Structures are given as structure tokens and as C-alpha cells.
Design a protein around this ligand. Structure first.
Ligand code: FNO
Lengths: 298, 298
């Protein structure tokens, strides 16, 4: 019916390399003459938790990093740390380098993840930054260093690099300057995320997507006020609806002919009465990983 | 996390071109010195109710087919018809043509789609060939010619070229020898998909995935022979389970320690009693597009 879709991963695939330090291997992002990767690559198994990364990095030289762009190795001619990433400088500059930016995405926003194993892509999927700054994603053995990204025109916006799996099975990582999302650190200690909540803006945008594809069964004649809806929102572990949230949904309400607060009344009913086993857009759950901008695109 | 993942699209992206014929444009696949696309490109509205493709093709010349690979125009140096496909021969040979195969997938199997819009890749998703030989896919105006595929090693197995949407909203098309999946024809016609059965192999795999994830409320201790299960399944429009399917579930059995026929005895009760409420991996309907292979990957 209507699908989660990932951006075409090709401009990213050509930047994926394999970084090995000592006995540890993960994925790196080769842009221009610089390779990014998680700094955890300099950690022997003995160093997890009680890791002082500045200490471990002063003892390494350029030769202790082996970069492999597919089969060809690249000469590492410099190295520095930035927050939780390593910046490896290499002799040759990636000819496949796309037009690109580094962006720190906000919670609620979505992006595509290219899952990699030792520098070779394996799969692609779409996900969202959860409000608790984790991502409920899929990262298996050797997935460390895979990047999340969006594409606009010819320009790749890299927003995420994977680092680790939390005890809850959800994932933690940084932007491409090495700053984590949320309260996490790259140490072997157990860490909890904050209590998650459902992305209200994305549920409403997703309700509009159904109305567009001829799914109107959940609509009603009623309506709420902003604060009236938010009190059902808090009761149900949903993000409060900001006044600008309404303004983002503006164009979607026009295309459908449903005032934003009317769609809220519909959502208010949906949350309090269940769905009676019916399905919206094909799902039996209120889906919160499509953005307004996602819905207009697809 | 358990998500639908699509293969890295890039090896296919570098093969997508834009075939134009008359006032009508669609997507084509550029491998070596020949380009494949639906023969429907040579029709018009006035020549579409019951077209004779041999007459329409004899009336075309090499110079009738504008082939654009991005900015570069390629000049048709030949043209033939293979079933419901056209094979245009072109001056230039694709520098990006990867190791490939042409492949005819069985119903139940999955593949990735690169949805394109006039030569430009737009998005990637995963889906499954249905038992009725349709695809519950996502194809807007312009996506004709987009191709489905799997990747094993660095070899692309092409297996679908999109052609039409049926009145159900699902989609029909051909392998890369032009032979349609199912009984469909590329005339405009009163055709509609047959009754769609559920992929029992993939529902069983979904149930194993859920046992691995946490919920096993649906397990019971009844037993069932293969035959008495297939009889119940067919009354509910579920595919009968073959003996080969039972072997394919070997790894997921044993790993859970559940025994295939016992998971069938569970499904049998889900079919005969439903779920008056209870959820499975968050939903109240049984996913049937996740293969045993997708589950053993996590
Ligand atoms: C399971 C344990 C309690 C947590 C392990 C953690 O110490 C860790 C493991 C890891 O494999 C890893 C990478 O592979 C890549 C980056 C990166 O930060 C990391 C990590 O922080």
C-alpha cells in the first residue's frame, strides 16, 4: 500500500571503507582525504569501560591504522580525535566523494541507514531519531560505524554514525562530528535511555497519509482544542503538540481538507477506543516514523 | 530490532536510464550495450486498447528511441523485441554494468525495488512476490520500468521489471526476459488479480521471530501432522506447507527448540480462534513478507 522507503544508498556506498586497529574492525566513512570512524576502534578488548581515549590515542601512530577501500589499502598519513570519532587523514582523496554536509538531526526526524559489515554494505532501511535520542534500529555483528543520512538533490546530509547497542536492544550513536545523541558514552558500562514517547507530529502526518490513499474510516465530525488534545496526549505517552507543529501540518491539512485539530480529534478517538481490529494505511499500530516531509515526498 | 531491509541499491542505480518514445517516457535498465524497458513505451493512448506490438514496432526506427543516461544522450544502434520487453542496442557500453544474472523468483520470495521516476532513482524498498503473482508495491506515475533485484556476493540477480497497476492497487510485471508474472497482459483489459493467499512459510517464520523476541502466548501443546495442518490452512486461504518449507524452518526450529509441526499447531489455533485482542510483535495481523532468511539475520 504505502511503504517506508530508504534513499538510494549509492552515493554513500562508495564512501564505505574498513578501518582496523590492532585486532578490532569496524566501518569508516571516506570523504575527500579523511576517514571517519568510531574511536572505539583503538580499544583492545581489555580497554572496554576503563578506557581513557586520549591515553590510548597518544600511544598509536598512523601505521597502527589499516584502511581498506574494498581491496586497495590507503596510506594513513595523519590522525586526530574529535569527540567520539577518529579523523584519519589518508594520502588519496575518494573520487566517489559526493556533495555532502554534516547535520545533527532533531528528534522526530527520519533518515536512511546503510548497514555495513567490515566496509561492505549489506542492507538499507529507514528509521527515526526517537525522542529519547536512541534509534530502534537493526545493527548486527560488525555494524559499528555505519552511517545514517538523508539526500536532497545531489547532496548527502550525513546525520548519524552508529556506535553501540543499549541493554534494551536499541541503538546509540553520534553525529558526524562525534557528539553522541542523548546521554550516552562509548564505554562498556550499562546505560539507560530516557523513557521514550510517541512522535505525535508523525502520527498525525501518517493519519493524513491514509486520508490521501482513501483511508477515511477513522475520521469523525468532532474536534478538540490544542490543550484539550494535549491532555489526552500526556495520558497516552505522546509528545505534546506544539503550536508550530500545527503549522508544519498546515499544507497537509489543506491538501486533505481536514483542519489539524479535527485530525487530532480523530487521533484522540483512535487512542481511547483502540482500532477495533481495523487497519490504517495497512498497519494495526499508530505509526510514528513518517514525517510530514516524508509524507509529501512519498 | 526486526525491520524490512532492502539491499544496497547503488549497483543498480548506475544502470538506470530514461527511455523516451513519442509523448511517453519510462525507465530502462542499461547492462553492457543493451537497454531493457517495457515494450509499452511505443504505445500511445490512441494505440493502447488492444495494441499489436509487432505492427507498432515495425513502424519504429532506431532514431525513434531517445535514451538518456543522466546528462549523456545514448543513440540506439538496434532494437528487437523479447516478450513484453524491448532490447535496444546502444553505441556506448555501460562502464557501471556490474556482475549480474537474470532470475525468475518464486512466489513467497522477496526482493528489493528501486523506484525511479524518469531515469532518476527515488527510493528503495523490500517486498515479496505474492502467491497470485502480484506485488503489494509502491509505484506512482513515472515508475514504469523500475526493477526489482537481490544481491548475492557482488552479483545482482535481476528479477522484476515493473509494468502496470491492477484495479486492486497491486502491481504486475515481468522478469528480465519479458515474461509476465502470473496471467497478466500489457493490454488495457478487465484483468484483476486472483484471490491472494497468505505465505504460510513466512508467517511461521514471523512466529519464530516473535518467540525469539519475547512473546510466546500463542504456543500450545497440541500436535499436528503436516497433512491435517495443510487442510486447515487451505480453508483459511493460507498456502499449504510443503516438505521443503519444513526443512527451511530447520534453523529457526532447534534454535527455539519448538519443532516445526508444533509451530504449525500454534498457527492452526490462531487461524481457528483468532486473537481476541492479543498482539504479536506489536500487531494483530500475521506478517507474511518476512522470510526464514530474514529472521536468521537477527
Ligand atoms: C555491550 C557492552 C556493555 C557495550 C560495549 C561498548 O563498549 C561498545 C562495543 C562496541 O562493539 C563498539 C563498537 O563496535 C563501535 C563503537 C563503540 O563505541 C562500541 C562500544 O562503545
Amino acid at each position: 500500500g504505502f511503504r517506508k522507503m530508504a534513499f538510494p544508498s549509492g552515493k554513500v556506498e562508495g564512501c564505505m571503507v574498513q578501518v582496523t586497529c590492532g585486532t578490532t574492525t569496524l566501518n569508516g566513512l571516506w570523504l575527500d582525504d579523511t576517514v571517519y570512524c568510531p574511536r572505539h576502534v583503538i580499544c583492545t578488548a581489555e580497554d572496554m569501560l576503563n578506557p581513557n581515549y586520549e591515553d590510548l590515542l597518544i600511544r598509536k601512530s598512523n601505521h597502527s591504522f589499516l584502511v581498506q577501500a574494498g581491496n586497495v589499502q590507503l596510506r594513513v598519513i595523519g590522525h586526530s580525535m574529535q569527540n567520539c570519532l577518529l579523523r584519519l587523514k589518508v594520502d588519496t582523496s575518494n573520487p566517489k566523494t559526493p556533495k555532502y554536509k554534516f547535520v545533527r538531526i532533531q528528534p522526530g526526524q527520519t533518515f536512511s541507514v546503510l548497514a555495513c559489515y567490515n566496509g561492505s554494505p549489506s542492507g538499507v532501511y529507514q528509521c527515526a531519531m526517537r525522542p529519547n535520542h536512541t534509534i530502534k534500529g537493526s545493527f548486527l555483528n560488525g555494524s559499528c560505524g555505519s552511517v545514517g543520512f538523508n539526500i536532497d538533490y545531489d547532496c548527502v546530509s550525513f546525520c548519524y554514525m552508529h556506535h553501540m547497542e543499549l541493554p534494551t536492544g536499541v541503538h546509540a550513536g553520534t553525529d558526524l562530528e562525534g557528539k553522541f545523541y542523548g546521554p550516552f558514552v562509548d564505554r562498556q558500562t550499562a546505560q539507560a535511555a530516557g523513557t521514550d514517547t510517541t512522535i505525535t507530529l508523525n502520527v498525525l502526518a501518517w493519519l493524513y497519509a491514509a486520508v490521501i490513499n482513501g483511508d477515511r474510516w477513522f475520521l469523525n465530525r468532532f474536534t478538540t482544542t490544542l490543550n484539550d488534545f494535549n491532555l489526552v496526549a500526556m495520558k497516552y505517552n505522546y509528545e505534546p503538540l506544539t503550536q508550530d507543529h500545527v503549522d508544519i501540518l498546515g499544507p497537509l491539512s489543506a491538501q486533505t481538507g481536514i483542519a489539524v485539530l479535527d485530525m487530532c480529534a480523530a487521533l484522540k478517538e483512535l487512542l481511547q477506543n483502540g482500532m477495533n481490529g481495523r487497519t490504517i494505511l495497512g498497519s494495526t499500530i499508530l505509526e510514528d516514523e513518517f514525517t510530514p516531509f516524508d509524507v509529501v515526498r512519498q
